[PDB]
Symmetry: D2
Subunit: 350 residues, 4 copies
């Protein structure tokens, strides 16, 4: 499914390469022989996987704002990629509330900017627009969303993603009609609850837990019974890649929306998770706070990807966790993270 030779030598432009996912993706792709260029603001964190693995060496990197159409246009045109991965985004919900303007301009205008650039420039066979599992109108039900369902979003962040999804659709219809020449294939990819090593995001369950353990402090669990479709970073990333390959060779036929996610079977509680974590950590412990600990959850239906891309996730919760834990320790102990990160990909690739 993931063809190395395919990647070998491809001029790939990725927006938002300095962040978590962008860095894992850029790595992989370079690991594979692709000629990458990144366009983003400086690493969103400290530490930052981007830096930790010294990616500016392995790839061309442009620091810039998605909101500068011209600069953005320029940067791409100079490059002439053939493949584009769009991931620059203001990703926090929390923030989304304080900074709605920022969220929207970044998330919606940036998307518009990007597709319009791709449009004006020309010579792009494949664009993979990264949105979110939150783009969907939230019915607060037990069911996993299908790609044909309505967009929305309750908070600014989620809502911004539903808009980005509308944008990609209109761009596709207006400018890259599959039904017709331009040679541009455009897919919007949806996924969430992404976990792995290199995630220095603040107020994130995994990161937290790890910081906690690392600093020997015990963890306060706010809601033990909460369930999420937790998935290793590489899982969705593989979907994106494959999708990119398909868009490339097959075009139009895959120019559409696509959900990436774990098996329902693989859904664990926060409590379960922290427990495993603990065990996994060794050294590690946690506590239940005084808030309300309530007993449905947002999920995606992956039938279309399984079925039409033959895509399937590879690691089970436990494995992923351990791999997460192991990668953290390595880091902490001063191991070469580029290498370990590399093996991580390698392993997933088997």
């Amino acid at each position: 499914s993931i063809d190395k030779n395919f990647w070998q030598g491809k001029r790939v432009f990725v927006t938002g390469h300095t962040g978590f996912k962008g860095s894992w993706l850029s790595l992989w792709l370079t690991e594979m022989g692709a000629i990458v260029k990144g366009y983003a603001l400086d690493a969103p964190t400290v530490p930052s996987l981007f830096e930790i693995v010294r990616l500016n060496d392995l790839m061309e990197s442009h620091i810039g704002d998605i909101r500068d159409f011209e600069k953005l246009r320029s940067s791409i045109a100079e490059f002439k990629p053939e493949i584009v991965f769009h991931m620059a985004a203001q990703p926090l919900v929390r923030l989304s509330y304080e900074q709605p303007i920022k969220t929207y301009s970044t998330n919606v205008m940036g998307t518009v900017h990007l597709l319009e650039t791709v449009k004006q420039v020309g010579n792009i066979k494949a664009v993979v627009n990264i949105t979110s599992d939150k783009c969907y109108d939230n019915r607060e039900w037990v069911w996993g969303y299908r790609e044909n369902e309505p967009m929305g979003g309750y908070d600014p962040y989620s809502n911004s993603k539903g808009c980005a999804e509308l944008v990609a659709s209109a761009f596709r219809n207006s400018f890259f009609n599959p039904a017709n020449q331009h040679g541009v294939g455009l897919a919007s990819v949806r996924a969430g609850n992404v976990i792995g090593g290199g995630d220095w995001a603040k107020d994130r369950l995994i990161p937290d837990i790890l910081r906690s353990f690392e600093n020997n402090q015990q963890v306060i669990i706010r809601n033990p019974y909460s369930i999420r479709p937790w998935q290793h970073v590489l899982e969705p990333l593989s979907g994106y890649i494959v999708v990119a390959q398909r868009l490339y060779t097959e075009g139009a036929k895959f120019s559409e929306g696509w959900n990436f996610g774990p098996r329902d079977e693989d859904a664990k509680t926060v409590e379960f998770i922290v427990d495993k974590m603990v065990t996994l950590w060794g050294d590690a412990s946690w506590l239940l706070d005084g808030e309300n600990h309530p007993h449905h959850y947002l999920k995606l239906d992956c039938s279309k990807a399984n079925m039409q891309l033959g895509w399937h996730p590879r690691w089970g919760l436990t494995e992923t966790l351990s791999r997460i834990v192991k990668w953290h320790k390595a880091w902490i102990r001063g191991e070469d993270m580029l290498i370990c990160s590399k093996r991580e990909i390698s392993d997933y690739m088997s």
Copy 2:
């Protein structure tokens, strides 16, 4: 019904007051005793109703860009309105195809700005967000859309309205939540009108203006899609709907803080051809038309919610409406007093 007394003295801020809808609204509103402050770019066209009726002299007209947050916020801040009508937009289809970015920035970020501005300023009781009949994902089918259907849009303009709809519901949810109404005091409604036609519209590529211009200049009008259908309606119709909701939001914010369609009666949802044929007839004196980028074929709106829930109904019929547009255009032509004609239409409507 519209309440002239409710309007008296009200501080009303209207974005996009320089346009077709804006001008008619501002005129209506000032005529009712309201204190209106507009914020838009210079008149979209020439001629322009704004200019034609000298509205600038009957209101506080401020020239500015919706994309300039800071400037927008200030404008609002200094006036402290109690009511707001957000109508500024790049409202054209074919153009949106040519200028995608300006369309989205204007329509989308402009809405965000306006709503963020409303949030920061405070003491605003009612917010009426004007979107479009094009916000709905178009299934190209025989049925009028319901408020509960999915947002979308094929072209950048349609799609930008779809996004504007999403934006308002997220602001509503996160910041003007009916739950915490007492905490914010904000009523916010998204209003979706049909295809407004009336005397005083110079917009490019629109049907009636197109028609009026050709007729005027003893030329035949060029028809691109004779069998398309739109929810045709006198410009004053949805305006009445907008006004009514503002009234209701003023006192029962929580309750009417949602989406509303304002369109004609189903029988008024005719084809392009029908209109042009009628218009030819209405004009007379040689009038003729002639047959010639993705546009929707069918577009209808189901208005049972406003009918039942707001108890709002349309006043004029398509034919009556066409007749009135003609009369208006000609009067203008003969150099009649348009402010006076325009005032007359509002009054007649109020009587209808």
Copy 3:
């Protein structure tokens, strides 16, 4: 439009011809020159229009049960009709609650029988399956249902129609497939009408009959649900729709072999109260009403498909309709010649 010439000489088999709808249909049909054979149980009520207009003497009326397959099949077989209207049913709500089994057997198996009979007999060109406006899952909302919405039904009657709808589409799919049209030659449509009201209906618990009976006997009519809404329409309205489709199915079976709603214009979908108030007025002479098992509150039908696709539109308004029912009832009362009055209404409608 209805085609009197198309009708002439046609062998038409009508199940449930003894009823209200049936009688009006049979009358219409024979009046057009058609050769009608009915198959139903004895008149549903007394009085009965069937009896009142002596239809039995103007057609081949056969008394039989839809649940008796063999008997039904035979009846059809011996007549070899070219057209079929399936209207036999236990059509009442409250009753269905009391008699669930008879309701389902009649409505469901009766449809199966009829369709299986049509299959075995052959040479039938058009089949018009009358279901009900109650076939749709009722979401209790402001919107008229579209042909493409889900079937359901809360009570046994509603639900039996939902099942009757499913049955016809499965027969269509499996046995009268548009694909193999040339192989079977069968056109089959499911028609969903509104709430028919007209002179000549004695059905139990129905509104207008209820009203007419009380008025008649200088008593007040007892109203159970004043604010409910139904798609009120003169009985001749949907009939026209049924007739029109049969015409079309006759020659373009494949093409019109689907579901169709036949209802009034949206403005005619008023409440119970409105009707009774109007009726009081129409009747006069002391007329009054008085306020008093699960029934739907709101029920409307979206008819854009028939409007656009069959080009069918309703002729009379609710008020006109109410007026005509009154006139009819009274004439009857004074001992006027009902066949003649009834013939007159059909003619007037044909003129409308």
Copy 4:
């Protein structure tokens, strides 16, 4: 999830007990201590699991037609069950075409008959109405149906099931409103592609294959690439039981529709299946015919059951198959099938 003690001593009335599923269910339930009564026509086949395991000994059995309301009413009233499983049905699609009247009267009128009886009689806490995965309006898509989707069915059999589903709904609304006393809890259960030992149905993939092998003849595979949500007979049956328990103790809250099915992950091709079969058989072989062998499939979304009943399937395709094969051999060799059948349940129960 399946409580033995619960079952112990329950007066349970099952319609369609002589057939495949009815016999497995009746067994289990008796295995568990329930006092069962069956109401059905004579065994639909030869051999017949019903006979093979000598069920008339283990349970009360009434031979009768579902279409005789009175008799049916009588039979239940005499019994006073507290739990009712409704499974009498004309189950063949093939037949459904030749015998539409039969199918409908049986499938729809029988259902009406049954619910009305339950109604008139009284004293039934739980009714489990067995429909089919085919009750749904078939959208010919990749997605698994949700319980809230529209009913229909293309052929008479499928369509008959969509009607039965409408019937149960109306009965529930009209007569057993959850929202209100009567103490009747009514669930409609949907499932299909049910496989296992004891299935003597003609023109059924598994049965066939087994007959074939058994008679040393080689098998002709019409469509190798076809995919179905194949599941061991006991899988759905467990759902039914549990559902029954819930309806019983909790009532109304579970008075609704429910889908039972396998994990998507567990979807195999006919070819795959026959291969495994072969291997599994030993002795065994097959051939591809001359028809068209084409490359979406009807499936159900089981989120509601997983989530709200905590229900999950237990055996994987392979296992099920083997168990199928093993049970067949046992039979053939003259082993006591009641016993083996018994162990089958026992095993599933672990």
